[PDB]
DNA sequence: TATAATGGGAGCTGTCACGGATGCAGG
DNA sequence: CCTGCATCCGTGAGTCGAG
C-alpha cells in the first residue's frame, strides 16, 4: 500500500535498547574489531578479508558478494577456505574468532536498533529535492558510519554521536542528488549562502536587492558579475513535458526546433556549394588542381601554391554569382 | 571489568560467584551443550543434528 | 567526528459506463 | 463445492486552430 508506512512498521518491530544493551553492543563491536586486528596479526591475512569472512558467516549464506575493497573475489568457497584456516588455529587464538563473530552480530543488532532516530532526523529534511525514503536511506548510511566509528568509552549515549553522522549523510545526499545538472558540493554551499544573503538583504530593505547590494553583503572578492554568474549557474532546467494551456493538449517541447539536424535546404546548400565550386574550377591545371585542392583540402579531407592562389583570385572576380553561398 | 581501572571488581580471596538482580531475564528456546576445553564451531554457524560441536 | 535526540504527513472530495476478474452468500 | 449475482478496478470518453 504505502511504502513509508511499511518501513515505519518494520522499524517498530525492533524494540529500543536499554542503556546496558547499548553499552554491551558497542563494547562487543569494538572488541570485535580489535579481535579482527588480532586475527590479522596471527594468521597474516588481510584485516578486510577476515572482517568480510566473519561478516559473511554472521549474515548468512544468502549474502556473499564481491567487495570493491578486497584484493580477491569472495565466493562461499573462499569464505570456507578462510573460515577453515581460522578454525584450525590454537584455542587461545581461536577465541578471537568467536569475539569477532559476536562483534558482527552485535553490530547488526545495534544498527537495526537505532533506525527510528534516522526517521526522526530525516523528517526535518523534507521537500528539499529528495524523497522521504531516500533521506531515510542516506541517514541509514550515516548511522552505519556512526556504529563503525562509535566509542562507548566516552560514556556518551549513542544517539549523540550518531545524530551528527546522520545529518552529515542526509545533507551530503541533498547537496549531491537534488539537481538534474550536477553541481559540486562546495559550489552548492556557495549558492545556498548567496540565497540566504539575498533573503536577508531583501528582508531588511523591503525589496529585492540588486547584484551590487548582494556583492556588498558578500564581502571581499565579490562583485556584481560574480553574483550574476553564480545565480546563472544555479538555474535548474525545465521539463519538456511542462503543460502548455489549460488542457492536456500540447507540451512546451513541441515549440522547440531542432538546431542540430540540417534542414533539406542545408544539405542542398552543401551539395550546391560543392557543385558550383567543382564547375567553376575549370581554370585549374592538373598539378595546380591536385595541389590547390590539397591546399583547401578538397581531396583527402585535409610556388604553384602561389600561382593557384592568384588564379583563384582571378576567377573570384569573374562570374560574381558565388556571393549567395557566402551568407 | 569496566571503563576505568579503579571501577573494576577483583576477588579478594578464593570463593564462588553468584549472580543476583539481573536487569532482565531472556527466555530462548535452545539446547545448551556445556563443554570443557575447545569448541570446533563458532558463533553464527548453522548445525544439523549429529554435527560435532 | 561525541549533552541527548529513537514511527510521516497531507488528503483534493459534483461523470459515467463499460469489461473483466474477483468474492461472497446461497441452492 | 459449483453456480449465480454483487462489487471492485481499470479503461475509455470527435477534429483542426490558437495560446
Ligand atoms: Mg562586493
From Swiss-Prot, chain A:
GO cellular component, one term: cytoplasm
Residue segments, region Sigma-70 factor domain-3: 189-267
Renumbered residue ranges of the record's region Sigma-70 factor domain-4: 280-313
Sorted UniProt keywords: Cytoplasm, DNA-binding, Sigma factor, Transcription, Transcription regulation
Main localization (coarse): cytoplasm
Location of this chain's protein in the cell: Cytoplasm
Residue span of motif Interaction with polymerase core subunit RpoC: 134-137
Coiled-coil intervals, chain numbering: none
Gene Ontology BP, a term: DNA-templated transcription initiation
GO molecular function: DNA binding; sigma factor activity
DNA-binding listed as a keyword: yes
Quaternary organization: Interacts transiently with the RNA polymerase catalytic core formed by RpoA, RpoB, RpoC and RpoZ (2 alpha, 1 beta, 1 beta' and 1 omega subunit) to form the RNA polymerase holoenzyme that can initiate transcription.
Function description: Sigma factors are initiation factors that promote the attachment of RNA polymerase to specific initiation sites and are then released. This sigma factor is the primary sigma factor during exponential growth.
Name used for this protein in its record: RNA polymerase sigma factor SigA
Originating organism: Thermus thermophilus (strain ATCC BAA-163 / DSM 7039 / HB27)
Covered range of the whole protein: 78 to 423 of 423
From Swiss-Prot, chain B:
Domain of life the protein comes from: Bacteria
Function: DNA-dependent RNA polymerase catalyzes the transcription of DNA into RNA using the four ribonucleoside triphosphates as substrates.
Similarity remark: Belongs to the RNA polymerase beta' chain family.
Quaternary structure, from the entry: The RNAP catalytic core consists of 2 alpha, 1 beta, 1 beta' and 1 omega subunit. When a sigma factor is associated with the core the holoenzyme is formed, which can initiate transcription.
Name of this chain's protein: DNA-directed RNA polymerase subunit beta'
Organism from which the protein derives: Thermus thermophilus (strain ATCC 27634 / DSM 579 / HB8)
Parent-record interval covered: 369 to 421 of 1524
